[PDB]
PDB file of C-alpha atoms in Angstrom:
ATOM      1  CA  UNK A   1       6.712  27.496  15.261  1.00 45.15           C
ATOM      2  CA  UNK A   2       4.704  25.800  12.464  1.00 44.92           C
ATOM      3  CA  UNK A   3       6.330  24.721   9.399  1.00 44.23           C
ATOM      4  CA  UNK A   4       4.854  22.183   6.396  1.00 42.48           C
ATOM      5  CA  UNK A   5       8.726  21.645   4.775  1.00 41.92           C
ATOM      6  CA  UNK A   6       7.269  20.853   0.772  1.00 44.70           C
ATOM      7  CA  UNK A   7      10.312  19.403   0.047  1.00 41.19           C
ATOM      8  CA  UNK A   8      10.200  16.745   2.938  1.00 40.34           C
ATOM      9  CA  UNK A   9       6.426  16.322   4.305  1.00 39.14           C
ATOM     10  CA  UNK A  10       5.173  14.166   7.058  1.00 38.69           C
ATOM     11  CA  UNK A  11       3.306  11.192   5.617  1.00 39.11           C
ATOM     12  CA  UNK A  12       2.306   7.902   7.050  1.00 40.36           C
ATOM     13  CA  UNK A  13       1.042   5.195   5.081  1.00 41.07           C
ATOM     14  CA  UNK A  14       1.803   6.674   1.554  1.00 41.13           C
ATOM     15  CA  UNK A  15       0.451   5.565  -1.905  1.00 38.97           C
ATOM     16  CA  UNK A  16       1.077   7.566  -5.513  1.00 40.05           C
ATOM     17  CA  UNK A  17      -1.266   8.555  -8.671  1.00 39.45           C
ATOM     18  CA  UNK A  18      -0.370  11.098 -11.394  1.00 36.66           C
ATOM     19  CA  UNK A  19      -3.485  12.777 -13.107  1.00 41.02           C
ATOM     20  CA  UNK A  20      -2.816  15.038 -15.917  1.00 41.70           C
ATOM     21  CA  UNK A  21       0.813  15.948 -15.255  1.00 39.79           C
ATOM     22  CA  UNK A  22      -0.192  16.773 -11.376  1.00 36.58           C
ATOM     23  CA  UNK A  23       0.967  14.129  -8.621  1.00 37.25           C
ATOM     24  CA  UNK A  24      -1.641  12.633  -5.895  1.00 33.59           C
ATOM     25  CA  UNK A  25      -0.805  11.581  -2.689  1.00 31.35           C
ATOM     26  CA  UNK A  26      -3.038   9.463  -0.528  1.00 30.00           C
ATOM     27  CA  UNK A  27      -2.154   8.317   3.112  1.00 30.06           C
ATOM     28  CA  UNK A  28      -3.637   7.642   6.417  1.00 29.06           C
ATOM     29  CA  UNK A  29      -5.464  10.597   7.840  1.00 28.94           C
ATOM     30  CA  UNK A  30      -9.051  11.779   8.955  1.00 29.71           C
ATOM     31  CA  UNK A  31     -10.975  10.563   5.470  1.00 33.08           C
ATOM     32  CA  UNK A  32      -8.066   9.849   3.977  1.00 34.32           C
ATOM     33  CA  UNK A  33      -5.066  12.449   3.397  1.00 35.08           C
ATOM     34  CA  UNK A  34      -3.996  13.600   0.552  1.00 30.71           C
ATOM     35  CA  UNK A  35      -1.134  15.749  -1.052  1.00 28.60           C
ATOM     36  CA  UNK A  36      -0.260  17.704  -4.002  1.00 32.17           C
ATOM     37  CA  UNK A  37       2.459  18.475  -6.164  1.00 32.44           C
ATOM     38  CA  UNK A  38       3.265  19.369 -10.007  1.00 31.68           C
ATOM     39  CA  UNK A  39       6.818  17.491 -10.078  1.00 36.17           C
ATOM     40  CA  UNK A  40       6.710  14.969  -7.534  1.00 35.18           C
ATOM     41  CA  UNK A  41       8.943  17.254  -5.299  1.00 32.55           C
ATOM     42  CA  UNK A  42       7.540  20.043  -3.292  1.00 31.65           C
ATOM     43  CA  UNK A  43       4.004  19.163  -1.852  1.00 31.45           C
ATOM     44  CA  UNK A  44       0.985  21.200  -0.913  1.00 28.60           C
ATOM     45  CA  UNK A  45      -1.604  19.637   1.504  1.00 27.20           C
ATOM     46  CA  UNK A  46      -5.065  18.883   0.617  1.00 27.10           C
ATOM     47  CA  UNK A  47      -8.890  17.936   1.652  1.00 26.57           C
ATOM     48  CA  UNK A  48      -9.793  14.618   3.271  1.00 22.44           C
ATOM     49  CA  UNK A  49     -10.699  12.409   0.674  1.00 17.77           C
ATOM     50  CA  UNK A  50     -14.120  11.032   2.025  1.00 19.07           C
ATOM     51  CA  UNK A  51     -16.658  13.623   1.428  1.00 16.35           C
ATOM     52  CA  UNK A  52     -18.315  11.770   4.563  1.00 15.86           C
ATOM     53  CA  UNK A  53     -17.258   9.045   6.775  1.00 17.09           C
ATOM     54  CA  UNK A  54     -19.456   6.039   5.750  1.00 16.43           C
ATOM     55  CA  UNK A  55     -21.926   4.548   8.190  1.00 15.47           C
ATOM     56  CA  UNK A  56     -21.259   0.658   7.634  1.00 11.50           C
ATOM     57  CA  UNK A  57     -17.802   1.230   8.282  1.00  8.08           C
ATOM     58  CA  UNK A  58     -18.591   2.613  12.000  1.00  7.68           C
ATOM     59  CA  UNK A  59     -20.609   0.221  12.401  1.00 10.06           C
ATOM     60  CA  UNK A  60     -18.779  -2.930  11.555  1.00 10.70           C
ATOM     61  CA  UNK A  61     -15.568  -1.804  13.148  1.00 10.78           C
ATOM     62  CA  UNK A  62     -16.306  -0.157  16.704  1.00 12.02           C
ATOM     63  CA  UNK A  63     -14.378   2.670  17.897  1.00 10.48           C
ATOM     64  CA  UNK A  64     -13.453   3.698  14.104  1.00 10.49           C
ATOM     65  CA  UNK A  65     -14.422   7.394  13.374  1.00 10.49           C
ATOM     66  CA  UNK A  66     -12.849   8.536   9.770  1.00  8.91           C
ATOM     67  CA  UNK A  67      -8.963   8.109  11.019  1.00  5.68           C
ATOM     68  CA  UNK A  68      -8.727   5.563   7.679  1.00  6.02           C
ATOM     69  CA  UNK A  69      -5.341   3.599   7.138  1.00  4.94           C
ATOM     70  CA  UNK A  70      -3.689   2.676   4.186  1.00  6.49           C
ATOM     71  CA  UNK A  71      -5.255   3.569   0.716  1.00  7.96           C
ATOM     72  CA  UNK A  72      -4.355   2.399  -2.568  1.00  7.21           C
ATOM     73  CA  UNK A  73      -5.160   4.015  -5.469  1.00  9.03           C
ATOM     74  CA  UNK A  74      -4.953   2.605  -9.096  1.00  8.87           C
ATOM     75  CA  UNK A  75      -7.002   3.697 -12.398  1.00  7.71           C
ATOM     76  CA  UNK A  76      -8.877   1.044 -14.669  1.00  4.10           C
ATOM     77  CA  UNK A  77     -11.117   2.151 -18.056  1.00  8.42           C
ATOM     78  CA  UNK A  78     -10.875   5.734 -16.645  1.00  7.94           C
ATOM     79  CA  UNK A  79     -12.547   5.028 -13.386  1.00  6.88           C
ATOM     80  CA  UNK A  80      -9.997   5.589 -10.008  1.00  4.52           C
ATOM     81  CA  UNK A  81     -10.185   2.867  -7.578  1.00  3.86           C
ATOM     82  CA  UNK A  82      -9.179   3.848  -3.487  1.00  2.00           C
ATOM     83  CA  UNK A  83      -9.779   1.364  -1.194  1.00  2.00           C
ATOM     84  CA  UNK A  84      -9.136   2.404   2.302  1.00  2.00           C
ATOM     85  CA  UNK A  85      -8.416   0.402   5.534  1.00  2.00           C
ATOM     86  CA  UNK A  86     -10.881   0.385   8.994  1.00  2.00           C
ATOM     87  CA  UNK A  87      -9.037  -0.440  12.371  1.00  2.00           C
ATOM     88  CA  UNK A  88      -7.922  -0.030  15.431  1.00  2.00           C
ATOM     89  CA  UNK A  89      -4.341  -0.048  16.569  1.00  2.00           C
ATOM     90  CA  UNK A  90      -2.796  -3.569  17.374  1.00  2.00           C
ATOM     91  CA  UNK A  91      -6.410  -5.566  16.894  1.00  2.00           C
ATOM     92  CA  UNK A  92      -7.691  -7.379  13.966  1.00  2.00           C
ATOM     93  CA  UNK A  93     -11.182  -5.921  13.608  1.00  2.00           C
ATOM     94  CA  UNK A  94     -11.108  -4.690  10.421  1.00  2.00           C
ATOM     95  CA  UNK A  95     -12.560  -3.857   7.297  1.00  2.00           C
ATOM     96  CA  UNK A  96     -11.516  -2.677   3.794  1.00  2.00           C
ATOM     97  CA  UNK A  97     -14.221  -0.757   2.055  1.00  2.00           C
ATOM     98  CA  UNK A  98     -13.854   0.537  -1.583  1.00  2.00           C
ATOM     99  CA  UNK A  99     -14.714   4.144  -3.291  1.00  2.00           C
ATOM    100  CA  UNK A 100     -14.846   4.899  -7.155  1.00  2.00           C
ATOM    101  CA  UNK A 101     -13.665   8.434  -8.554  1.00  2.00           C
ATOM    102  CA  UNK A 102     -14.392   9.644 -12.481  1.00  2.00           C
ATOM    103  CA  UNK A 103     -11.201  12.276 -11.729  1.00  2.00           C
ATOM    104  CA  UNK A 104      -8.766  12.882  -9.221  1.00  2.00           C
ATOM    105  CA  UNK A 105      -8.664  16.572  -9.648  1.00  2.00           C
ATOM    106  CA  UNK A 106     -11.082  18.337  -7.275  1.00  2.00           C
ATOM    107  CA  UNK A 107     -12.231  21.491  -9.247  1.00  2.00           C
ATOM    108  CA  UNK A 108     -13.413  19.067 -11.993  1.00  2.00           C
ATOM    109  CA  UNK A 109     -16.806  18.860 -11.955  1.00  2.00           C
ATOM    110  CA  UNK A 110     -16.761  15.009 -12.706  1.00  2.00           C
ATOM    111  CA  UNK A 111     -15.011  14.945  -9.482  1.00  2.00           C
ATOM    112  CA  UNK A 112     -17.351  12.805  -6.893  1.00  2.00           C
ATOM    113  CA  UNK A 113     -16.168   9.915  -4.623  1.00  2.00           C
ATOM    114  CA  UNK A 114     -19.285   7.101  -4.428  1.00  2.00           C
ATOM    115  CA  UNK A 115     -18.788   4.735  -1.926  1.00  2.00           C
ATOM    116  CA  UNK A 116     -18.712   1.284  -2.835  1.00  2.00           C
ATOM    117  CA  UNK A 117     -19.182  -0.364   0.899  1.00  2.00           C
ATOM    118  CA  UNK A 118     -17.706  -3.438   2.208  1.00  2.00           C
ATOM    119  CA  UNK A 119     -14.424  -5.542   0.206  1.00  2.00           C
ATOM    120  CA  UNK A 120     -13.206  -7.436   3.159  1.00  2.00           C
ATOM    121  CA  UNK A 121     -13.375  -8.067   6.969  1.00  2.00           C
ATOM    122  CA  UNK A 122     -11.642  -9.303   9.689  1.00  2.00           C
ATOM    123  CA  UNK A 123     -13.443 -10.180  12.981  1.00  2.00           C
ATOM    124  CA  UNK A 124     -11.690 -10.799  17.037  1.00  2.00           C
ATOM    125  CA  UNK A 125     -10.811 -13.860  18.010  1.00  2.00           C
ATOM    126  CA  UNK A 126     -11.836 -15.926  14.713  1.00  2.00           C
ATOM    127  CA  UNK A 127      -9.722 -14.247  11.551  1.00  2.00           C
ATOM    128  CA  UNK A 128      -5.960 -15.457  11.088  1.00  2.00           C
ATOM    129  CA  UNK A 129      -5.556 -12.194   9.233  1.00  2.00           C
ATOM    130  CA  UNK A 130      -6.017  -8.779   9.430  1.00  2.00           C
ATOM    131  CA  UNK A 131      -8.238  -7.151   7.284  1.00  2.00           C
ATOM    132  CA  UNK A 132      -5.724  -3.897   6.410  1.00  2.00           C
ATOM    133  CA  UNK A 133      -3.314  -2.677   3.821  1.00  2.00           C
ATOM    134  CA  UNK A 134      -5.078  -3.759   0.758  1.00  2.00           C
ATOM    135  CA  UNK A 135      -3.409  -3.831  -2.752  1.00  2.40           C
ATOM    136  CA  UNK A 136      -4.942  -3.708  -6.237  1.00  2.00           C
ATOM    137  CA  UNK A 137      -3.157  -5.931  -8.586  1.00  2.00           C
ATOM    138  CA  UNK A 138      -4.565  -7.237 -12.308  1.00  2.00           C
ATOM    139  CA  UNK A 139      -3.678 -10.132 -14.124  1.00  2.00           C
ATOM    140  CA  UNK A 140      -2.570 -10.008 -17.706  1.00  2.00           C
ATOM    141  CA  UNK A 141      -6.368 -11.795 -18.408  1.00  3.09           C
ATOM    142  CA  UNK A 142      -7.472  -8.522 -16.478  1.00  3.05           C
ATOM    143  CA  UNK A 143      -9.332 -10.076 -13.896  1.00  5.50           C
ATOM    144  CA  UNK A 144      -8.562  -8.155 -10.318  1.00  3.03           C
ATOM    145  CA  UNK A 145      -6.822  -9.374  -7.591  1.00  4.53           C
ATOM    146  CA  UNK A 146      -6.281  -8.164  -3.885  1.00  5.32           C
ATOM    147  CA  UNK A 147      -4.024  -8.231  -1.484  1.00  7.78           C
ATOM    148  CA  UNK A 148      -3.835  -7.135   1.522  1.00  5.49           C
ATOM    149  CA  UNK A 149      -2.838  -7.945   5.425  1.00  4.75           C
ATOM    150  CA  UNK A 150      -0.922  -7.671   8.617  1.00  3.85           C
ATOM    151  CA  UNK A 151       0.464  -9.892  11.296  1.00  2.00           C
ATOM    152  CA  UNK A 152      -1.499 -12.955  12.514  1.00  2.00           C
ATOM    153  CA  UNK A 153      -1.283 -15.539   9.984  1.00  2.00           C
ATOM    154  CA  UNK A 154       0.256 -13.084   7.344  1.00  2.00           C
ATOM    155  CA  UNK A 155      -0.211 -11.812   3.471  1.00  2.00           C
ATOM    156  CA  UNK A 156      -3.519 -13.048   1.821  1.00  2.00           C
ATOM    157  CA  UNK A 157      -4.333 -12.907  -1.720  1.00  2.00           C
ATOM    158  CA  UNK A 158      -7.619 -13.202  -2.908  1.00  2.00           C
ATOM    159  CA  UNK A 159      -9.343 -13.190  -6.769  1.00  2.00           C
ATOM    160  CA  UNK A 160     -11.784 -10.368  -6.878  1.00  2.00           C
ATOM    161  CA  UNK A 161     -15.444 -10.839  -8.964  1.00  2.00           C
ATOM    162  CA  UNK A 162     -15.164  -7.857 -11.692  1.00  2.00           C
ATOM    163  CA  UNK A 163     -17.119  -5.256  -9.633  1.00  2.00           C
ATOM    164  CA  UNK A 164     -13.954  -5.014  -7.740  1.00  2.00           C
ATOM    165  CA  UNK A 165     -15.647  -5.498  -4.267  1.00  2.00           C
ATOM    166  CA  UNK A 166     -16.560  -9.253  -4.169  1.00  2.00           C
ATOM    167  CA  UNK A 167     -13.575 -11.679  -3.253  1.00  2.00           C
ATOM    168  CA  UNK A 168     -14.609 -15.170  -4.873  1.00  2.00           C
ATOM    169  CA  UNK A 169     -13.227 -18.105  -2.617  1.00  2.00           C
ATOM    170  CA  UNK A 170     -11.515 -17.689   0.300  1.00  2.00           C
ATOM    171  CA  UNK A 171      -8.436 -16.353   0.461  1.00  2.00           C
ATOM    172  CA  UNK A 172      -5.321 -18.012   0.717  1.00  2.00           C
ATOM    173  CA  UNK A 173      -1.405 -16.744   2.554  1.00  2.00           C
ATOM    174  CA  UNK A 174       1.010 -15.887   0.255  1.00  2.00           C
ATOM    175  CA  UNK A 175       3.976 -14.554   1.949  1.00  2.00           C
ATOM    176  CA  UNK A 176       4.711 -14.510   6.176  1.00  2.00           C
ATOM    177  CA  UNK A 177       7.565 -13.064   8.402  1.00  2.00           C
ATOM    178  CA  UNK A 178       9.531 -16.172   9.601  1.00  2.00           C
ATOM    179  CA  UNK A 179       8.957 -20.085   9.929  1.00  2.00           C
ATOM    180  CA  UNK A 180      -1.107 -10.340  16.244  1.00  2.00           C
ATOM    181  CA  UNK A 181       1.635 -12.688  17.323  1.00  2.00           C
ATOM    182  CA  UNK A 182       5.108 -12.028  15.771  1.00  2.00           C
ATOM    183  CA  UNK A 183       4.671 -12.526  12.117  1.00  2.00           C
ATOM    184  CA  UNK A 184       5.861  -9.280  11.541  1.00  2.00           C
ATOM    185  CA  UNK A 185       4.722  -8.513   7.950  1.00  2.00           C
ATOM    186  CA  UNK A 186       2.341  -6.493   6.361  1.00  2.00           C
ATOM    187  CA  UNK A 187       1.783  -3.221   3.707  1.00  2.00           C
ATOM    188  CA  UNK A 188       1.936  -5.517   0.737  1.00  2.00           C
ATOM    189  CA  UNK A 189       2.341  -4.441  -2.728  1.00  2.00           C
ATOM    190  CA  UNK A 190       2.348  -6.769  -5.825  1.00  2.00           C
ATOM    191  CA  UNK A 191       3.421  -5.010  -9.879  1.00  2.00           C
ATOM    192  CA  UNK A 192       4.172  -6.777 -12.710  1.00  2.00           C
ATOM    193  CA  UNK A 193       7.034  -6.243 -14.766  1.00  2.00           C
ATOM    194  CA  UNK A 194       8.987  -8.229 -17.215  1.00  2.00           C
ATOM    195  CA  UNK A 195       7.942 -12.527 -16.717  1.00  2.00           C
ATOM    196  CA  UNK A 196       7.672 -11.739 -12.836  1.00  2.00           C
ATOM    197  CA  UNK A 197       5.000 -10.648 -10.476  1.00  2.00           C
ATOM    198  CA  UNK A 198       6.777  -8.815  -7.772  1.00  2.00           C
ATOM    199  CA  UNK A 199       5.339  -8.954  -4.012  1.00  2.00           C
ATOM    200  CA  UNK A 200       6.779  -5.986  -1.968  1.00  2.00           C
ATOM    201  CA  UNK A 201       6.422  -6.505   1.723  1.00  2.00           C
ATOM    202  CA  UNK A 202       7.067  -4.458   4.833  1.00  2.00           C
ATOM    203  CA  UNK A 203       9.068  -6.615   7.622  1.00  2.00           C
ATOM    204  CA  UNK A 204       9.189  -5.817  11.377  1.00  2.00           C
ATOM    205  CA  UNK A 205       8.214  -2.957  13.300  1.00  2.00           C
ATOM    206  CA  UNK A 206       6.700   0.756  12.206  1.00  2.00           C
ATOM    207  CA  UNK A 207       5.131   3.205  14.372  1.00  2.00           C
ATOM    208  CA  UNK A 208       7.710   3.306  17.018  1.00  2.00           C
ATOM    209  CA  UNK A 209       9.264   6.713  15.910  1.00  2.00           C
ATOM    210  CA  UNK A 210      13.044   6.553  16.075  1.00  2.00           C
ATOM    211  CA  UNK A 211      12.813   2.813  17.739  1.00  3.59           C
ATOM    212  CA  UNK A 212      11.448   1.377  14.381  1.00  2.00           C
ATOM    213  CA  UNK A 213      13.057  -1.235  12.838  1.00  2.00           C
ATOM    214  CA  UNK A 214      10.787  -1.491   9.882  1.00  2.00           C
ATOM    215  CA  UNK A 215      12.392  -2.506   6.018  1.00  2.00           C
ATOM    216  CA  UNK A 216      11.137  -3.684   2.922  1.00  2.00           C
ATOM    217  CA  UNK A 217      11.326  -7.061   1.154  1.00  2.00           C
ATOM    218  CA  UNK A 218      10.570  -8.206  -1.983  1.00  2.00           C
ATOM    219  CA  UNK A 219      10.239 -11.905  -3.993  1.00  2.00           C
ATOM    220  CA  UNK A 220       9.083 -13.135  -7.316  1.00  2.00           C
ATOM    221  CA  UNK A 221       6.467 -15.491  -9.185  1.00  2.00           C
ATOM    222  CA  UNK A 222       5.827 -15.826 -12.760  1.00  2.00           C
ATOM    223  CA  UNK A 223       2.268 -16.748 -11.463  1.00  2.00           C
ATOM    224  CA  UNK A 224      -0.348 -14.568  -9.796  1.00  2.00           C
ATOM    225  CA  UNK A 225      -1.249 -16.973  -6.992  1.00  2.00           C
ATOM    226  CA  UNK A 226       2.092 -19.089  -7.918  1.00  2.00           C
ATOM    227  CA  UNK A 227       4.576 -19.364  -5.063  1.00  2.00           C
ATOM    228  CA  UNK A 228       6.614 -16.031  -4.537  1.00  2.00           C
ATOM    229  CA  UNK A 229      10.412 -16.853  -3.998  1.00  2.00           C
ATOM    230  CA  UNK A 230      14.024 -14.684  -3.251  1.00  2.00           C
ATOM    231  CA  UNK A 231      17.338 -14.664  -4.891  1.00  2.00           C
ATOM    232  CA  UNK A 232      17.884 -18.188  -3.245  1.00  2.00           C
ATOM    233  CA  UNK A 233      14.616 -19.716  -4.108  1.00  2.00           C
ATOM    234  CA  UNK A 234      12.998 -19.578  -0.820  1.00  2.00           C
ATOM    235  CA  UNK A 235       9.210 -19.138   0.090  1.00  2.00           C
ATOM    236  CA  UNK A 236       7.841 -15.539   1.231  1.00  2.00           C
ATOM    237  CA  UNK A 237       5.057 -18.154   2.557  1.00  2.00           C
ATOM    238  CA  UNK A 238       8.170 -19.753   4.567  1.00  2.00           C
ATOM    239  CA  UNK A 239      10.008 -15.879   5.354  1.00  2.00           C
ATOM    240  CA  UNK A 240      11.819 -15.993   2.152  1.00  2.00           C
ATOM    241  CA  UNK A 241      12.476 -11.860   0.364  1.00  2.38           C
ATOM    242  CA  UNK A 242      15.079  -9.689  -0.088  1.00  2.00           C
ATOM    243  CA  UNK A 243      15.220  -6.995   1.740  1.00  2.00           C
ATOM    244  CA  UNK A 244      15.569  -3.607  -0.282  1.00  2.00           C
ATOM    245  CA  UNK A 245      14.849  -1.347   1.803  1.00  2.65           C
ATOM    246  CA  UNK A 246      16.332  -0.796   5.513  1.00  4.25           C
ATOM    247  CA  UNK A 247      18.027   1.134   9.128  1.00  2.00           C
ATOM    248  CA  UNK A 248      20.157   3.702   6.655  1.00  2.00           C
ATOM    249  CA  UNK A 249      22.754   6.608   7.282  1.00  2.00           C
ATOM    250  CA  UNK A 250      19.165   8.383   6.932  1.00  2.00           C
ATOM    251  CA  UNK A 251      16.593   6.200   8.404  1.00  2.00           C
ATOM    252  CA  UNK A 252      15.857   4.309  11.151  1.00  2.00           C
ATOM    253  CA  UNK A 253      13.117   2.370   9.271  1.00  2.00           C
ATOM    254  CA  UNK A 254      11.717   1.985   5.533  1.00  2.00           C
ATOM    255  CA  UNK A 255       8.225   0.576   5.212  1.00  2.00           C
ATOM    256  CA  UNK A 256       4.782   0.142   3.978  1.00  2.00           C
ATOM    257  CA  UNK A 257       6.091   0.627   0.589  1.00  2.00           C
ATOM    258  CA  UNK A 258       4.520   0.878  -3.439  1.00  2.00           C
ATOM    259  CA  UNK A 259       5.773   1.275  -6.643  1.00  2.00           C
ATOM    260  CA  UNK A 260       5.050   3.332  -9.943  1.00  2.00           C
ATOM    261  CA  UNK A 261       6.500   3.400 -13.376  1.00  2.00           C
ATOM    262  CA  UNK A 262       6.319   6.941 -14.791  1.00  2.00           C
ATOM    263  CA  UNK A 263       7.885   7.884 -18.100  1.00  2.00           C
ATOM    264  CA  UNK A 264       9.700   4.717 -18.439  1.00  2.00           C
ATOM    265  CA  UNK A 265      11.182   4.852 -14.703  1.00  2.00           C
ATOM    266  CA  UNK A 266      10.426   2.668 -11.308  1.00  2.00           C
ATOM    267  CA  UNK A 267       9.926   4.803  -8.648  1.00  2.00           C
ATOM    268  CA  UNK A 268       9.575   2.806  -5.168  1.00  2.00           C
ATOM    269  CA  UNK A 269       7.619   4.418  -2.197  1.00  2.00           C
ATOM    270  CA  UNK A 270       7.589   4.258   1.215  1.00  2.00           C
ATOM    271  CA  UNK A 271       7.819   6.146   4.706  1.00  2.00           C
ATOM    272  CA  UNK A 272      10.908   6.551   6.311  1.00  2.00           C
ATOM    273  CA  UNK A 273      11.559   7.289  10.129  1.00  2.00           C
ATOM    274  CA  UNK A 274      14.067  10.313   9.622  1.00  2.00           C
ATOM    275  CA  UNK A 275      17.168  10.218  11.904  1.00  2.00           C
ATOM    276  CA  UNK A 276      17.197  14.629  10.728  1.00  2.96           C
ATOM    277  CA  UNK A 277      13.991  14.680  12.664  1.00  3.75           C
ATOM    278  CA  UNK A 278      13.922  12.584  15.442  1.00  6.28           C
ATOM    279  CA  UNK A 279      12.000   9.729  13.944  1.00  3.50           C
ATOM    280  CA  UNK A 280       9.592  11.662  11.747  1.00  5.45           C
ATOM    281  CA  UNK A 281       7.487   9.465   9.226  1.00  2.73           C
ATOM    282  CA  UNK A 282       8.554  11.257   5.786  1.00  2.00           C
ATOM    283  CA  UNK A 283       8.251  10.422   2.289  1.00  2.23           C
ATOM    284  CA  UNK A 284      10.798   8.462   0.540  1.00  2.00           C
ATOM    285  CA  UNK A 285      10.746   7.922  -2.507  1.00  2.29           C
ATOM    286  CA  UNK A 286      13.740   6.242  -4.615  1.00  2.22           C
ATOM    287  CA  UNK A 287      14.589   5.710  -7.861  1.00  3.46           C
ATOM    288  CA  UNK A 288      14.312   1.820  -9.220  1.00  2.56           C
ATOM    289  CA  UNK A 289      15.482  -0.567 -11.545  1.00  2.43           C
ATOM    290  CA  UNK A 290      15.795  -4.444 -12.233  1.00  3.88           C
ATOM    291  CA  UNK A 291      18.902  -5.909 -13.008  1.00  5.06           C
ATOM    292  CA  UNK A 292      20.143  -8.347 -15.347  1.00  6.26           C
ATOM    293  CA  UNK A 293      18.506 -11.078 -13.326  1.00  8.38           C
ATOM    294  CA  UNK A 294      15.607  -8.871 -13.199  1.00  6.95           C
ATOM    295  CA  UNK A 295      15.642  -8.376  -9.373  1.00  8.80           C
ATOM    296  CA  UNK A 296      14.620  -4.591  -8.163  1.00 10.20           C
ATOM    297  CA  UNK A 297      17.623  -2.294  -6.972  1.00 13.50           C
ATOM    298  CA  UNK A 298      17.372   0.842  -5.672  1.00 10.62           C
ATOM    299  CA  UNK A 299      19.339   4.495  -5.463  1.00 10.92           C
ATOM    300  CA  UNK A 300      20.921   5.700  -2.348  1.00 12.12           C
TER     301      UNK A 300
END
């Protein structure tokens, strides 16, 4: 019996944009998924994303074939940002590649995806970091920054040149699991609000279906680069967060999370493995807000 269920979709690997009152969905798929809805609450499929699956990225990472990972999406001076993640499961021969949109609505005419090639790459037996899950973050001198990674050595954050494909130096860890191996930490997610930069982080394991274990964490900096920190002062680089997100009355697991403010409200975003179906990957998607500390709280 086949059933889509608009109200609670299948998603993996979500992230959010809103584009003239419509809501955009973008998660791992063939060319990148994508969903659809006018209130942020029943959804409609879409078209892959990628209009074709780019050459250098089949190239660089073998066995890859347009089954992307991870987007993020973000707009700056009215041009849409995706970048998109390159793998395959459980090794660290990656890339993250880029694409630039004028519009995210499809019947627009404007509407054209250019490929941007190559942001960063991971290589066998040589990176300490795997080159997936990359995040878009500005600083308030509006220079870009990126984040991304997954197990091995853990979260990197580099400075990007302004052509938002370029990393300057090298990059440098920024938050880890504990003290692919078993620093369990990746999807990372970095807003700013208030005098804070907040890192969101996905702990422990997805992609077992209802044997996930997966949760959310988040610290704080006032600094880009500076050292991100939880309630009790401790390092993300050292395993230091607070977890936010976690095994519920409705989930088994909570991960590879994002954030949006729209209309003066934090929303946080994530997948959850749904005890109602078995372990499912749906969309969650919660209300936030930051206390009087100005730590991030969330409903249900």
């Amino acid at each position: 019996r086949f059933q889509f269920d608009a109200t609670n979709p299948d998603v993996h690997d979500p992230v959010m944009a809103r584009e003239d009152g419509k809501y955009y969905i973008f998660m791992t798929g063939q060319a990148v998924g994508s969903m659809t809805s006018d209130d942020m609450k029943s959804w409609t499929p879409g078209r892959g994303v990628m209009p074709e699956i780019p050459q250098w990225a089949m190239e660089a990472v073998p066995g890859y074939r347009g089954h992307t990972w991870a987007p993020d999406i973000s707009e700056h001076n009215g041009t849409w940002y995706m970048y998109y993640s390159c793998s395959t499961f459980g090794k660290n021969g990656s890339a993250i590649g880029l694409m630039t949109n004028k519009t995210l609505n499809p019947e627009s005419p404007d509407y054209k995806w250019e490929d941007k090639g190559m942001v960063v790459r991971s290589v066998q037996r040589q990176t300490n970091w795997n080159a997936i899950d990359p995040n878009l973050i500005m600083d308030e001198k509006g220079r870009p920054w990126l984040t991304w990674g997954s197990f091995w050595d853990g979260i990197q954050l580099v400075q990007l040149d302004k052509d938002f494909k370029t990393p300057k130096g090298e990059p440098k860890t920024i938050a880890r699991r504990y003290l692919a191996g078993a620093n369990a930490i990746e999807a990372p997610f970095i807003i700013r609000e208030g005098k804070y930069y907040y890192l969101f982080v996905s702990w422990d394991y997805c992609c077992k279906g209802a044997n996930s274990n997966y949760k959310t964490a988040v610290g704080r900096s006032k600094k880009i680069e500076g050292p991100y920190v939880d309630r009790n002062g401790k390092d993300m680089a050292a395993g230091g967060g607070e977890v936010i997100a976690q095994r519920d009355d409705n989930y088994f697991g909570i991960g590879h999370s994002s954030a949006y403010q729209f209309d003066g409200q934090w929303y946080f975003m994530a997948h959850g493995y749904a005890r109602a179906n078995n372990g499912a990957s749906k969309l969650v998607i919660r209300k936030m807000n930051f206390d009087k500390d100005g730590w991030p709280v969330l409903e249900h």
